[model samples]
Target: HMKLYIMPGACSLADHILLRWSGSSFDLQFLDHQSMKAPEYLALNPSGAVPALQVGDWVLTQNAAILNYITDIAPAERGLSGDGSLKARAEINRWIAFSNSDVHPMYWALFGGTAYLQDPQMIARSQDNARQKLRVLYQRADAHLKHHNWLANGQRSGADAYLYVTLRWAKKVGVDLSSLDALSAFFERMEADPGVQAALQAEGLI
Candidate 1:
């Protein structure tokens, strides 16, 4: 059996949701990030981050690895892994890298600017810069999804599910998504999926 500790609406949500989507046997262990220094949680992950997975005596961290591991274990049903070709695996890595390196940083920078941009003039400049960066990232994603259903593979892969969380936050950050029809359509499609809905509801966000 597999056990995963996660926080609702965090990046770890992708891992928890995908495990359920794969029909895998697993238990959910929730953690409080604000108070995650508990000895038990620390024993699982030294970094004190949520979404740590425990299988028997082994522990797994890192979203990309955890997500891929879950899919690989149950690929026939999850459609998130394959060994038919190197190109296929590379494609998965491509999107995961994009989400982690590009999309994720924009969000962090935005939050940092909002929370720590001390100077009035500097804050305005930083916010505008963040918006511009996010706009570029959204357009890149929009272009990629224009002709495909998922970010990496042609089908709905784990990367798509992981990255879709960002789209959900577009409105909250005041990002205009009206022009990103492809991305909007992708968001709608993911939401319409029973697995995706279940995952969101599991986090009590629906």
Candidate 2:
């Protein structure tokens, strides 16, 4: 049995959706920001982060890693891991890297400004800079979506779920994606999924 750790609004929602799409039995352990640091959670993951997957005797941490594991358990025809090819898997990993490495850290200004920086003016500047940078990156994704229906290959994959999480964060902070018609269309498709709907409902996001 697999139990996934998640915060309702955190990026962990990506794994939540993928697990739902997996069409397998699982449980969700919802954690708040404070509870994540509690001893109960810390015992499972000292890193004190969401998206930890407890698989019987072992625990799997990290968003990308958890996403990959889900694809392994899910039916191959679901296309969550691409076409089971070196290049196809590489493509999904590439987009996941972009989301995790390139786009996610920029949100620190909006999310962890007080924890890392104290100067009000500096925080303001950092948030502004982050918004602009995020916008540019969204444009890159939008460019890709303009041609391909999904983030990689010709079907939905882990990269698509991951990107959807970032897009939600983008709107949360007001990124002015009004012009990205392609991304909007992609969002509509992602939102319409029964699996996506189930996860959102479980988290009360819908």
Candidate 3:
């Protein structure tokens, strides 16, 4: 069986949701940021990251890579991956990259800014910068979601799962998503998914 090491409510949630959606047999090992540095866990992923997947003798790290691996092991109809066309794959890659590279980093700035700055004013400024940048980045996604139900190819994919995780961060950071009707509705839709619900419950997030 495959084993997934994750931190509850972190970006690893995306991988957890995809695993549940795939309906596959896998073991889940929950670890916090500190626990991730334990020697045993570090053996699986030296980076001390939450999203490390152990498949037999091989361990896979990185959220996007793990998500893609899950799709490869499951049925394509799950729509966790693209529809096997070049254009479809490209669109899926686009959103996934945007979420992982752009949105997630801003969240780091928002959530971890205080760790890097001792001055109250500088910390506040860092969070403010992250908030403004996130708003602009999310605008692009909101506009795309206005016309499409999912991030790519009109079907749910790993990118949608990634986006869902970031929305949770947005709420925590007070990003004010009320004005983005399309994005808000998308959040509701994902929340209502049975697979998502199951993942949340398992992670004790509900």
State candidate 2's TM-score. 0.96
Whole-model alpha-carbon lDDT for candidate 2: 0.87
Model 1 residue 80 lDDT score:
69
Residue 62 lDDT in candidate 2: 91
Please report, in order, the local distance difference test score of every candidate based on alpha carbons: 0.78, 0.87, 0.86
Task: Report the C-alpha lDDT of model 1 over 41-76, residue by residue, as the tens digit.
Answer: 887788988668899999998888888888778758
Q: Which residue segments of model 1 deviate by more than 4 Å? A: 113-117
Between which residue pairs do clashes occur in model 1?
none
TM-score of each: 0.89, 0.96, 0.96
Off by over 4 Å in 3: none
Collision pairs in model 2 = none
lDDT of 3 by residue, 73-102 (tens): 888767666677888877877888899999
| Each prediction's number of clashing residue pairs | 0, 0, 0
Write one digit per residue (lDDT tens) for candidate 2, span 95-147. Answer: 88889899888888878654567788888888888899998998999999999
